[PDB]
């Protein structure tokens, strides 16, 4: 058996494995397989516990953009729902259990990807800042995929594994939490903007010279990581019904009537999003035949 371990820990393999890879590869492969199957042929997954089934599979009439692996059902709630707890396969398919399986095995896989990165980095004789950098996307994924469902108390409102699902999740998140006014999404925005700025500037400087750098590269790589850490922490805080600043109706007059600010308009837009229609006393047709 020792030859197998010698190959596993070998720093000569064409694609490195390491001891973390021995657990990374099965989880990632399982996640990819079940995600592909659920994307292609999943049945309509009812998502809100009412008689409004939602379909997110290609075979059920969706294109690439509109396709999305539907989150679990509100009937599930936050409960662990493996296949053996399903009395048959059809209920598990119709209750969004594929989503839970995908997310769990994928989170294990990305953690093991971190482990593999560090293991190769130290076996190659290098100080491992690459995992310090890679922790930021992992932290963001955990915050938006595991921490938020637990904080909200259900897996239904998790981000669907689809392009349109991402947009719907983001808009509903803004409506219910006002993430834009929360300082940590601004920290994340500043982090990614600074990352792009430093990328452009550093590339221009290097290419213009094509024929303090230490700390320069250090801060260059450190700014976006800190930003992503901060925005992941902000999302995790938002999970337990914490929101951004509410500056609405914070300015009055001598008598007591609200003056109104741009934050008031932001609040009005959020309320408009959270109810997709008009308000009351807008002259419904009184008489119908």
């Amino acid at each position: 058996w020792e030859q197998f371990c010698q190959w596993v820990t070998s720093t000569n393999n064409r694609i490195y494995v390491g001891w973390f890879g021995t657990l990374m590869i099965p989880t990632l492969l399982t996640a990819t397989t079940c995600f592909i199957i659920a994307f292609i042929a999943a049945p309509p997954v009812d998502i809100d516990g009412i008689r409004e089934p939602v379909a997110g599979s290609l075979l059920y009439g969706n294109n690439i953009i509109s396709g999305a692996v539907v989150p679990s059902s509100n009937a599930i709630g936050l409960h662990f729902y493996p296949i053996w707890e399903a009395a048959s396969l059809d209920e598990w398919l119709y209750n969004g259990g594929p989503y839970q399986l995908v997310v769990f095995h994928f989170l294990i896989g990305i953690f093991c990807y971190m482990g593999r990165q560090w293991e190769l980095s130290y076996r190659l004789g290098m100080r491992p800042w690459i995992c310090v950098a890679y922790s930021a996307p992992v932290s963001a994924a955990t915050a938006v995929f595991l921490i938020y469902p637990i904080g909200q108390g259900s897996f239904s409102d998790g981000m669907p594994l689809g392009i349109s699902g991402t947009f719907n999740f983001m808009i509903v998140f803004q409506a219910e939490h006002n993430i834009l006014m929360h300082p940590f999404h601004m920290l994340g925005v500043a982090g990614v903007f600074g990352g792009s700025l430093f990328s452009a500037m550093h590339g221009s400087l290097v290419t213009s010279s094509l024929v303090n750098s230490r700390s320069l590269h250090f801060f260059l790589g450190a700014w976006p990581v800190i930003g992503i850490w901060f925005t992941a922490m902000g999302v995790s805080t938002m999970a337990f019904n914490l929101n951004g600043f509410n500056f609405n109706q914070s300015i009055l007059d001598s008598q007591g009537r609200v003056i109104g600010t741009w934050a008031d308009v932001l609040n009005r837009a959020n309320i408009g999003f959270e109810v997709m229609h008009e308000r009351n006393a807008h002259n419904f047709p009184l008489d119908l035949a």
Partner: peptide, 27 residues
């Protein structure tokens, strides 16, 4: 329930193999 048992043994053997290999790291 046979699927539950199969998954249990599979994941248990995987984690046991990982921890056993990590504790006897040759390099």
């Amino acid at each position: 329930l046979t699927l539950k048992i199969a998954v249990y043994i599979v994941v248990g053997l995987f984690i046991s193999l990982f921890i056993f290999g990590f504790l006897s790291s040759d390099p």
